[PDB]
Design a binder for this molecule. Structure first.
Ligand code: ATP
Ligand code: ATP
Ligand code: MG
Ligand code: MG
Lengths: 599, 592
């Protein structure tokens, strides 16, 4: 029977007293196949009605039925089907996409329908040929006159060959010639079985119509028909219960290339949120190595202890003891022109004394009980003043000694324990045994692991301030990485929330021309991940370049990276940049297109 | 004679092959006061010519003279004057500011003309009345139908009473009633001496013009005059505190109109401050605890290992770069008054050697923690009364030097003198300052100075590492937040380049733009700044309360640096784009 059935349709805008009655109990039925022209004074509710017909708005009250199916009760996907294939809409203000070409803007509604890309541009190019724009098929909207942009919008509405053709003032900016051709086009579509509902003010245009309604003050005044209307059985239906993503991907790349700034800035906000978190973790762990190393080098940790060399020999065969020293001293007199410490092979490693000049007590010296002495930094300057002491001799208890090297501090003389127990004091008993406990093993554990291992005192203030300042450096690195991470995240959020919501109009258009709710989320997720995992890649390998640059010029300490921070910094900056690139696009795609088109 | 003289005027668009010839050697002299209607096929160059006449575009070649004065040769403020007082422009696409009410949009061009605010709204409301929109004066453009929007535009163009009214299809989206009413307005203004140039496709509209020109493919085909033009009398030429007080009011509304943009940008600088400050203060705090953990491992001393008198040490202790001094001579260490402060040894139980013991050569000994636990005295068949114990760091015993040189060994010559070098004085400076200070006393030798200062080394060595740390992560976190503002800022203002093109076409001067865009920055900069300096404060309070370890010790140099950097950068990027737009041709600014 009818194709559109409106009854008791009311419409309101505003809050009240700021509220206005815009469509008042208007009841209208349009007969399938008609050519209806709507006329009225500016701001009388015409466009408001057209939107509720084309499923871009939703009336406050009353019924509206397309092919007898109540529109409000349809589902969201069902409604999108109507806007894609039943309705072809010519927007008053032409509502193109400013980044797409003429042809691209025409074929857009056909992508969500689902025809091959090759078929689209040829048709879109032909629609522009009919409407006199074949010369300008590549120009973008802002490279076209208003009248041309209008005809572009016309071609779009005819791209999917929709049954109904809602045309809100489709001639407004067109000359008589261009305008007549458009009416030639619309007439021939009426003649081929199409339904036309056209708002206009030009009477010559309204002449091409069979029926002419007049609206005024939200109510319907006139109703005129020249002829009766041929009958027509309704078309079958347009309801659709992989390639969809191939297209979504192509759209998202183009979009990204179109908005070079927004895109570049966005990925650049992700780039930093990664490298900043990564560079402080690696600068933090780098300055912790040096600081702890500078503390370990201020002295060692040792455990001074029937104690024969075979005890200190097996003591050195552990992995929780890295060096050992048998000990024995002597108090006598020296001569050139005191204390002679009888020490072990590794004593200069057990106490951290470092070699200044010459060499230290080798293994041959302790085996043969050599009469060789290593001098203390102090006792070396006092005896020899500023002259080289290497080789020259000293006399301890009328017994020669050949100076072989100098060491640092914490008169003192260091000779083997075999030479003090054979050539200075005699006897076989030694004073004590000293061991250098490893840096990793626990302190109080070894103090009881040596009591056990020998039966079969210790100084550890460095080993304390090490563990004490490693807990401090932890809290520092840990709490500045947390800042930089929360910083760079809110950095992505801000630039993502802005650059996305700044295209809520674009969704409103896409929804008006057929796209389904999911079609939007597809290309906006693809837009995010595609811009986030390129910013991510650029991120992990921009901090690399920074490390190299740093480790090259900087000498104090090195920037050592942590693959945990890399992961955490990337998986966080993208998990947050994708969430805020999706959330806004979704909230827009679920708005009534006209409410999305008024932003 | 002529109010508009256009000769040889050409115009192109694009880059060959993408280049098009749009206006082709068109010469057209319009007589002052006339009423002209231009017609032609869609895209024949009508809007282009219209923009050139109104000083919104500029021709590739050929002349174009308003009141005989060449246009290109005019200054950027002389044009801005024309657009405000010579031309009233009705834009084909109506080009309203979405965030302004219907009345606000119409009065706008009167700001940059300098009219009181109470008079603007009353006239704007009246103009809307004359166009039938007095019912909707509060409505924002998206709360209006296309036609209504068109009439708001018409109203705006007539706000400054410009002599020339460049109407580009003023009646396209209007019924005949409204359209004719608009024609009644234009027809009367013509009577009152206004010049009218009107682009249209309606012929009934064109009839109401004495002169009718038809353009096709960029050339002029038709030129028809019904009656001769009424003789013309040339009109007079038309060429900061308030100006700014208005721009401020524009900035505040602009900010409140873009709540998200604003809250996000000011949040962008809030972080750029809190981060920089919170890392400078987390670092300086941990440094204190680390440098303290190192200083507590030992002191720094310079032992002057005969000719060594107690008056030497007595004068040595009277410096500010020396904090304590000690004469020095089983083991019984004849030591001085402050020896337990020189080496850092601290008191366990009992007491230390007082000034009465060393003065009286008392026979009292302070025991080492190791030599105290093993035994529990008589040193060389000479009693000694124990009095205390110390911090360990053979058997060690501590007695006065006066007791060892009198009751144990004899002799008046001591062993050495140990001084405790201060924490702030440089080391190698003191090693050469004591060689001088004591040499002035002439008591040399010895002066064979030792210096144990590895602690004083491994603080300067780690303070140089902690410096490079806090200094390079404060540079990161600063560069980070600085770009974070640039991003959010460089978008937010490029987002409104068209708003500028509107303001520039409708009268504003270049400077007028920079005024309200700077005030938009500084006003949003120094609020997020305040929000930043005191949000970091609250973070410190939260950190110092729950964390026992190192306290977050702030710096009043990073506070300044962070703020003055996050604003100077947010201001530089709120201005740079706004200024680059306001110097484009208004049409090129309107196409974005
Ligand atoms: N940026 C551009 N790049 C290339 N060509 C352009 C550009 N802008 C406009 N053009 C072309 O130059 C011509 C100028 O059109 P103009 O703006 O004068 O439209 P018009 O004559 O007012 O048409 P209508 O009557 O439809 O409004 C058009 O044919 C258009 O295709
Ligand atoms: N968001 C809104 N808030 C308040 N009022 C609104 C809103 N949107 C539209 N209106 C009002 O609803 C009415 C309907 O406008 P509509 O767009 O239908 O006009 P129209 O019939 O298309 O006229 P034109 O020929 O000018 O396009 C107008 O009077 C307008 O002021
Ligand atoms: Mg309308
Ligand atoms: Mg035009």
């Amino acid at each position: 029977m009818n194709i559109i059935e409106i009854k008791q349709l009311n419409r309101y805008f505003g809050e009240g007293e700021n509220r206005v009655h815009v469509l008042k109990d208007i009841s209208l039925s349009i007969e399938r196949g008609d050519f209806v022209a709507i006329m009225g004074q500016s701001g009388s509710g015409k466009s408001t009605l057209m939107n509720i017909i084309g499923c871009l708005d939703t009336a406050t009250g009353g019924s509206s039925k397309i092919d007898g199916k109540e529109t409000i009760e349809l589902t969201n996907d069902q409604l999108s089907d109507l806007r894609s294939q039943k309705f072809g809409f010519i927007f008053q203000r032409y509502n193109l996409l400013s980044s797409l070409t003429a042809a691209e803007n025409v074929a857009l509604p056909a992508i969500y329908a689902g025809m091959p890309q090759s078929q689209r541009l040829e048709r879109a190019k032909q629609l522009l040929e009919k409407l006199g724009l074949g010369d300008k098929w590549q120009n973008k909207p802002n490279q076209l006159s208003g009248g041309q942009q209008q005809r572009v919008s016309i071609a779009r509405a005819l791209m999917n060959g929709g049954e109904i053709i809602l045309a809100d003032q489709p001639t407004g900016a067109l000359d008589s010639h261009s305008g007549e051709n458009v009416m030639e086009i619309l007439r021939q579509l009426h003649e081929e079985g199409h339904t036309i509902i056209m708002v206009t003010h030009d009477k010559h245009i309204a002449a091409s119509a069979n029926r002419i309604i007049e609206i005024k003050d939200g109510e319907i005044i006139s109703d005129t028909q020249k002829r009766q209307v041929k009958s027509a059985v309704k078309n079958p239906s347009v309801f659709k219960g992989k390639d969809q993503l191939m297209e979504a991907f192509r759209m998202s790349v183009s979009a990204i290339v179109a908005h070079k700034m927004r895109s570049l800035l966005t990925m650049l906000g992700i780039i930093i949120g990664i490298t900043s978190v990564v560079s402080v973790v690696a600068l933090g762990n780098g300055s912790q190595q040096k600081i702890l190393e500078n503390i370990r080098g201020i002295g060692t940790n040792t455990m001074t202890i029937n104690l024969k060399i075979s005890d200190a020999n097996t003591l050195s065969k552990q992995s929780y003891i890295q060096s050992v020293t048998p000990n024995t001293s002597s108090s006598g007199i020296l001569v050139v022109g005191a204390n002679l410490y009888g020490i072990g092979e590794q004593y200069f490693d057990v106490e951290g004394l470092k070699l200044k000049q010459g060499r230290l007590l080798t293994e041959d010296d302790v085996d043969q009980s050599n009469q060789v002495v290593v001098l203390d930094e102090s006792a070396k300057k006092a005896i020899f003043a500023n002259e080289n002491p290497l080789g020259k001799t000293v006399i301890f208890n009328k017994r020669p000694f050949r100076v072989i090297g100098v060491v640092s501090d914490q008169l003192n003389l260091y000779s083997p324990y075999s030479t003090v127990l054979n050539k200075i004091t005699g006897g076989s008993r030694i004073g004590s045994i000293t061991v250098k406990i490893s840096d990793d093993v626990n302190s109080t554990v070894a103090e009881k692991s040596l009591t056990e291992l020998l039966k079969s005192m210790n100084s550890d203030t460095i080993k304390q301030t090490i563990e004490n300042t490693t807990g401090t450096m932890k809290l520092l690195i840990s709490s500045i990485a947390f800042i930089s991470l929360i910083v760079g995240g809110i950095g992505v959020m801000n630039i993502m929330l802005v650059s996305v919501t700044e295209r809520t109009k674009e969704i409103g258009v896409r929804m008006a021309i057929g796209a389904r709710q999911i079609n939007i989320l597809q290309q906006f997720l693809i837009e995010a991940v595609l811009i986030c995992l390129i910013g991510g890649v650029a991120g992990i390998l921009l901090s690399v370049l920074i490390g190299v640059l740093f480790n090259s010029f900087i000498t104090d300490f090195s920037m050592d990276f942590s693959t945990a921070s890399i992961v955490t910094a990337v998986l966080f900056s993208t998990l947050i940049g994708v969430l805020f690139g999706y959330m806004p696009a979704k909230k827009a795609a679920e708005l009534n297109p006209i409410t999305a088109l008024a932003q």
